[PDB]
Design a binder for these strands. Sequence first.
DNA 1: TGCCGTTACAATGTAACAGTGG
DNA 2: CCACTGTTACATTGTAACGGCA
Lengths: 50, 50, 134, 49, 72
Amino acid sequence: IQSLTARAPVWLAAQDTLNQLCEQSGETLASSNDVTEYMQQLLEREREAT
Amino acid sequence: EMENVQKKLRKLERDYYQIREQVVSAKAGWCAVMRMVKDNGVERRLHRRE
Amino acid sequence: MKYQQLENLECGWKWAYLIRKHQEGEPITKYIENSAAHAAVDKLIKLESEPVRVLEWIEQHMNPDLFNRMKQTIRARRKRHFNAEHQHTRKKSIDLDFPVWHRLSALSQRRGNTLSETIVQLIEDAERKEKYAN
Amino acid sequence: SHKQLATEQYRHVEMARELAEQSGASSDLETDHQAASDHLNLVQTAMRQ
Amino acid sequence: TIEERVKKIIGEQLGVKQEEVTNNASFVEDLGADSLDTVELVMALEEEFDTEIPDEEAEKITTVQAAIDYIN
DNA sequence: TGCCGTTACAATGTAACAGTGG
DNA sequence: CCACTGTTACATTGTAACGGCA
Ligand SMILES: *P(=O)(O)OCC(C)(C)[C@@H](O)C(=O)NCCC(=O)NCCS
């Protein structure tokens, strides 16, 4: 329990940051690879828009 | 010998009693703020569970 | 130190206290000349919304004789602020008729107890008398 | 702790009751032994006479 | 009557009004009171009547009616 | 000592109740 | 009935005096 508690706040803050970031987007992310692809589409949209 | 422990039980009981009134009053106070804040304030803005 | 002191709160308290005193006519500043006192008071008035500079204003223009009163007022404000959160720590204020108060205080000084302690003891004795009879 | 104390009290009550019983038995035995001593003395007197 | 205690306190502890609670419903899910809230509700009921309720008896109050059933 | 909690007040403002007379 | 008055039980803020403590 104490180990999980120590881990807790970091995980919770991470979750909240991710939730905010994804909600800001229309998509909800589920994986580091998923984030990497979303970044790639972001770059593509950037290099298009520019 | 046991009567002394009975008196200690009485002390503990009065302490419990005090704590109980504290908790019930706190919930009474909370009730209304939950009711109002359910207008999307608590959803993710105020409830910074971190 | 029992209650932690918060600057943005106690400084607002001090600003409000000084403004109230000035509105009451108290000479906030140490300047006998009316012009300097008025200038310092105007600086204070426009100094609203500033703890870090109201403290400096106090250090520089504050009347020497009000320091203790302000200090004890802030002590009381802090204690009341921290105690008003929970019911058991709150305090109930009542008014007692002069004869009753005189007798009750007579008992309290006689026994060396406080008003709360004296009344608690007396009520406990009344309850004990009830139990003796019952 | 409250239940523990209540249970100890109950045990105490039971054991006190039974010891009251043994006290009554001891009193009865005391009466019997007084009678026994009286008999002894009577027999002694009969012997001597 | 005396039930006015319960049917009042319940609301004050759950945010619902006096008539909102229905005897057939259940506090745990049909009133929105969660785990923490149900503990708080039962403890407020204990406080109000100046009595005691062990854990075992306390767990059988999930329904609205039980709150008076053990009382009366 | 200098701060800090603590008590016992003082002064005024309010809500609520009880009276009073038309 | 209705209004105005008297009263109690607080609150609210401020202050002086003790006493504890570094
Ligand atoms: P639920 O998710 O609201 O969580 C409830 C709780 C674990 C925080 C606590 O309030 C509770 O319901 N505990 C159950 C009763 C219990 O643990 N009693 C212990 C008595 S020593």
